[PDB]
Design a protein around this ligand. Structure first.
Ligand SMILES: Nc1ncnc2c1ncn2[C@@H]1O[C@H](COP(=O)(O)OP(=O)(O)OP(=O)(O)O)[C@@H](O)[C@H]1O
Ligand SMILES: Nc1ncnc2c1ncn2[C@@H]1O[C@H](COP(=O)(O)OP(=O)(O)OP(=O)(O)O)[C@@H](O)[C@H]1O
Ligand SMILES: Nc1ncnc2c1ncn2[C@@H]1O[C@H](COP(=O)(O)OP(=O)(O)OP(=O)(O)O)[C@@H](O)[C@H]1O
Ligand SMILES: Nc1ncnc2c1ncn2[C@@H]1O[C@H](COP(=O)(O)OP(=O)(O)OP(=O)(O)O)[C@@H](O)[C@H]1O
Ligand SMILES: [Mg+2]
Ligand SMILES: [Mg+2]
Ligand SMILES: [Mg+2]
Ligand SMILES: [Mg+2]
Lengths: 494, 490
């Protein structure tokens, strides 16, 4: 059960978060891997992290060859991630080779004599006993006056003699267009055993970082683009490798509303995702406030992500329901993260949610309006976002509370117009009901995945005491229409 | 002068799965075939698998000519599929011709190409008595040459000398565009008799590999792009060629709910595809759980593909219905999978689903939420998936249970919004009904191709003992609306 052999192609772990999953183990040992991308896309970082993680986790000496940036500038830039390459240079584990051109000529005639640096790189590998090599900005060395034929053979020589020395290599190349050729000369990608493509695409004034493994000769890999973020190095979150393997339990928590707990047969599940959906002014934010307030009353932390209202505006409205966000914040039981949805990409939004959750370590998490985050973005990006947040919440055993404002008050025949209701364990439906020329409100627990729930579409009023849930309209027809018909006949009472 | 032909053009089988069907036989014999594509499309695999299948199956010696990749790499990379290439080389069946240049460097003697290359290849053809030849990356020896007219002659001269020796050739060529010109110099297409194109198109963030036969002179072939995956090599699925050749029987199978069995006139068919459609929280997964359980109570094995719930959560919800999942993997009768829809493309999903079948060989198979796999993908690509999956179970006599959540919880006028109900044998319809200010739910067997079924829209209740199916709303109208009205002029 390995099985069916063989020696074949094995991989060297990069320990870049999420990469070893999409590469099914890492980079092919003893081979050169081509990392391609446009400006400021993370190539230069990819090569350094490949060396840095090899030295401090596997004790494998590395050599970094630079043709543009100075050695001191590479060391200085890496300090932003909290690691210093100088100590490794001092220990003799890391060697930064300056192949950068002297600010004068000449010139030469094919520029470099080659052979050495190929001897230079060779000499460095011998001296420091290195197994990993990163060559940064290979493209820059070519542009003197080189047809695609010369560039093809030159990469081949480099890759070949580095293959002799049994060294895994990362080669960095530049792109101009985001979806055109893989490289600048449209040839490098064919001569390379392995090709990784780093992309920085627009999409409506927001930016999105994606990584893709185009080909790994002699082995397997995940295919397509994958979202990543620059943070503590390269942070790839495979949207699919997040194993559909989270726990579950029959433990219950309260909503803060007594009747709503009875309606859910004892309250929400600790291991659940709750969706409060309905028109505007219905009371989605009120239920969020009570859901968080109860956690604090238990001594556990609550974390709120608001995208529509500010803290002072949230604290004012909440106070009118008797609850004090102000005091709960300064004690460290409640944290309110207010941000504009359009301020960053949904991938960047996801990082902040993860980071804040890890820092604060809450037992309850609420997002005021997922629908607010769904504006101006593709449904694919948004649905991908929800999976990320929903899955990560279920993974950390944190109770999730999400709200969704429907664009359609009265007569909405859909729970959510972005269709994410299949990712949620619990759905609370809120809607307007027209009773005698006045706008009433009704609440319905649409579904409880692991529980019995009340079936009634029950009227509720909002007061200082909060949500007062009452009886269902038992003499009306077409309540979910929003416009009921009173049918007190047949009177059926003699 | 006396004709002597005497039928038409003959083809040799490549034995690459699915290729011989779209090629209407194979590759035109004694002629060169151009296999073109971008980087990482499968050109080298096609070239290698062509020789490997020609040696291990037909005992026909082959020659592999390389200009870039070294023999050792070709041998080592082929080990990925379990192809012992070195043993073949020892037997004298395979010979890898290394025409790669020097890592030292030279230019002028690029004209000695062909002229000396042809002589070596044909010597090797005679030495090993080879009938098949693969030349990988004939593009490499084109250092732009002298424009494209020089390229035109060189390709022509090569294919001609191979023609005289009576060998079937595969020449691979690189291209930078997926839908641009077929080759680099925009000439290769017209000089070659046969043109095969491998594509690796994006369309979103998932890759999709397709193979197309553009032209085969003197012969016929299937037209257009065909989806293929790589596992044992190139595995082409002529999803539109699996001619409707499946068995069918009147053997009945139980769903798990006795009241439903009677509604379906005795129960499901063993040769069936059952679709359960409805809004969220209606009970599709509940009926799925019953369908899989019932088979494992018969000693029969079941397979579940979950795309929205986890094994722990599936177990929790089921255990609440009195359905113990945990003992079913214990017996080894039930096998969960659990994967994310976005993890791979739909072709990779199909393949994975197929492999689990081959591994297990299930009697019953359920795929929870087909609607989940229809997200962010064209309906044309979704239907291809459904047909492949649905058709596969019909081939293996496997009972198919599929689910689909409708985006509208009431007022829904359609079974599916993907329009795949036309290719489903049985349809059970779930919906919410507003009865007296509360949310009731109703089960309806919409259609069944080989059986009588209950025509009633029956009220059902979900309890700790599963679904209890009750009466039809005899006193109501507009139940389909979701908002019925009580009538009693009766
Ligand atoms: N501490 C940090 N946190 C977040 N992002 C960072 C940090 N440091 C750098 N970055 C990001 O990394 C990007 C630069 O990446 P890097 O220099 O590694 O490769 P590159 O810019 O693609 O190479 P080049 O453009 O020189 O070919 C910048 O756009 C910057 O936004
Ligand atoms: N002090 C109060 N007394 C009575 N009713 C109140 C009081 N404060 C607010 N309400 C009611 O609550 C509604 C506001 O609900 P809330 O702000 O909690 O969520 P929401 O309106 O769903 O949020 P969104 O702005 O996203 O729609 C108002 O329409 C108002 O009718
Ligand atoms: N064991 C395997 N399982 C699945 N896919 C594999 C396996 N081994 C290789 N592959 C796939 O094969 C592809 C490489 O194809 P191959 O090298 O045969 O031709 P090519 O890439 O067209 O050649 P080139 O691009 O160098 O001209 C890779 O993208 C990889 O995904
Ligand atoms: N112990 C229980 N008692 C009563 N009803 C239950 C119980 N467990 C579940 N239910 C009902 O079953 C429904 C869940 O159905 P199930 O999870 O089988 O599929 P589904 O909800 O249709 O799938 P989807 O996630 O696509 O909505 C809930 O809405 C709930 O009303
Ligand atoms: Mg850099
Ligand atoms: Mg609000
Ligand atoms: Mg190749
Ligand atoms: Mg379900």
């Amino acid at each position: 059960p390995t099985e069916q052999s063989s020696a074949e192609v094995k991989k060297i772990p990069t320990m870049i978060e999420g990469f070893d999953d999409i590469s099914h183990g890492g980079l092919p040992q003893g081979r050169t891997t081509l990392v391609s991308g446009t400006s400021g896309t993370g190539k230069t970082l990819f090569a350094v992290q490949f060396l840095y993680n090899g030295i401090t986790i596997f004790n494998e000496p590395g050599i970094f060859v630079t043709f543009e940036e100075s050695p001191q500038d590479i060391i200085k830039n890496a300090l932003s991630f909290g690691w210093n390459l100088q100590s490794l240079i001092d220990q003799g584990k890391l060697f930064i080779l300056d192949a950068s051109p002297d600010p004068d000529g000449q010139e030469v005639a094919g520029d470099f004599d080659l052979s050495a640096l190929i001897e230079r790189i060779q000499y460095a590998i011998r001296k420091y006993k290195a197994t990993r090599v990163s060559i940064d900005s290979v493209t820059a060395v070519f542009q003197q006056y080189d047809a695609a034929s010369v560039v093809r053979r030159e990469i081949f020589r480099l890759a070949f003699r580095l293959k002799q020395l049994g060294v895994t290599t990362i080669m960095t190349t530049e792109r101009v267009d985001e979806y055109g050729p893989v490289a600048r000369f449209g040839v490098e990608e064919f001569v390379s055993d392995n090709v990784v493509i780093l992309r920085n695409v627009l999409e409506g004034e927001r930016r999105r970082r994606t990584v893709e493994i185009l080909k790994l000769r002699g082995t397997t890999h995940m295919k397509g683009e994958y979202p990543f973020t620059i943070n503590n190095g390269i942070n790839i979150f495979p949207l699919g490798a997040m194993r559909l393997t989270q726990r579950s339990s029959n433990v219950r928590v309260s909503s803060g509303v007594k009747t709503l707990d009875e309606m859910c047969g004892g309250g929400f599940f600790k291991d659940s995702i709750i969706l409060a959906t309905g028109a505007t002014g219905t009371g989605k934010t009120l239920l969020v406030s009570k859901f968080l307030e109860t956690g604090c009353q238990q001594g556990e932390r609550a974390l709120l992500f608001a995208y529509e209202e500010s803290r002072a505006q949230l604290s004012r409205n909440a106070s009118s329901w008797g609850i004090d966000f102000e005091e709960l914040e300064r004690r460290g039981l409640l944290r309110i993260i207010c941000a504009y949805p359009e301020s960053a990409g949904l991938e960047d939004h996801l990082q902040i949610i993860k980071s804040e959750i890890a820092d604060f370590k809450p037992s309850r998490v609420a997002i005021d309006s997922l629908s607010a985050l769904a504006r101006g973005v593709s449904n694919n990006a948004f649905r991908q976002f929800v999976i990320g947040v929903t899955g990560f919440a279920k993974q950390e055993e944190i109770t999730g509370f999400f709200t969704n404002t429907t664009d359609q008050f009265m007569g909405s025949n859909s729970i959510t117009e972005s269709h994410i209701s299949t990712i949620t364990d619990t759905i609370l439906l809120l809607q307007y009901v027209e009773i005698r020329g006045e706008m009433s409100r009704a609440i319905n627990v649409f579904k409880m995945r692991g529980s019995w729930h009340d079936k009634g579409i029950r009227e509720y009023v909002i007061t200082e005491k909060g949500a007062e849930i009452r009886d269902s309209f038992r003499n009306f027809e077409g309540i979910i229409s929003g416009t009921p018909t009173r049918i007190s006949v047949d009177e059926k009472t003699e």
